[PDB]
Amino acid sequence: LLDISGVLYDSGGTAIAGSVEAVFCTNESAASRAELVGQLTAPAPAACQILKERGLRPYLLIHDGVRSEFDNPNCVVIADAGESFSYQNMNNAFQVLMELEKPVLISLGKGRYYAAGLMLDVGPYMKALEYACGIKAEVVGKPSPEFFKSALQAIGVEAHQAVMIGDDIVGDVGGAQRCGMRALQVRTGKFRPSDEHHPEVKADGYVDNLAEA
């Protein structure tokens, strides 16, 4: 299983050297799959399924590029929204949640940041609403075990015979290991030196890039 941002490419985007020739379980939510795949398993379709099953109608706190994936709100769906994380948009999501009988916040990933310099990801804004509303988000995407399992099922491979490759030490590496996989940390993308000596997560191996992997 291959992470995309920080492994194949960095958005902005630009291919990481050696990664095109070296060649997917992604939390990408700024762009639809079609748009991402054009630029080159994702959380939006898995979210769509969960919404349908529960009669949930989302207020979408998202980037315009992923809106296609969701083609009287009773929950909020928050993604890697970037510039769309205006105060107006955040406040509107907040005010929706604060009027619900049963407030539900669905988050597409919980990454802290990604490399582009370093950029704030969905996670910090997820935490803002959790604190503001006094609720816990449901995370669809990595490191949720159902996300990894769906990606494994798509290729017909069990966890003990699979390896995840990623730049996010907790989200990718820790997450995959928790599901019974092996996992490798790349030193491209969001990687910082401390991630190789992380107090909680010891990757099964550390590699400079996808090519070395």
Q: Which helix (H) or strand (E) holds 164?
A: strand 163-166
| By CB under 5 A, residue 41 contacts Mg ion | no
As a whole number of angstroms, the distance between CA 129 and CA 91 comes to 9
Backbone angles phi, psi at 31, to 5 degrees: -125, 150
Binding mask 42-81 for a copy of itself (x = CB under 8 A): ---------------------------------------x
The pair phi, psi for residue 69, each rounded to 5°, is -65, -15
Query: Should residue 5 be labelled a site residue for Mg ion when binding is judged by CB under 5 A?
Result: yes
Q: Which residues contact 77 (CB under 8 A, 6 or more apart)?
A: 47, 51, 58, 59, 60, 61, 62, 70, 106, 107, 108
Site for a copy of itself (CB under 8 A): how many residues? 30
Q: Which of residues 116-135 bind a copy of itself (CB under 8 A)?
A: 117-121, 123-125, 127-132, 134
Is 188 known to sit in a ligand binding site?
A: no
C-alpha distances out from residue 39 to 8, 9, 35, 63, 66, Å: 11, 10, 6, 16, 13
Letters for 164-183 (x = contact with Mg ion by CB under 5 A, - = none) are: ---x----------------
Q: Which is nearer to a copy of itself, 24 or 85 (by Cβ)?
A: 85
Q: Is 163 in the site for a copy of itself (CB under 8 A)?
A: no
For residues 209 and 189, give the distance between their C-alpha atoms in angstroms, rounded to a whole number: 9
To Mg ion, the closest distance from the beta carbon of 142 in angstroms equals 9
Does position 3 interact with Mg ion (CB under 5 A)? The reply is yes
* Position 195 contacts Mg ion (CB under 5 A): no
**167 annotated ligand-binding residue:** yes
Indicate the DSSP class of residue 54. Answer: H
Known binding residues for Mg(2+): 3, 5, 167
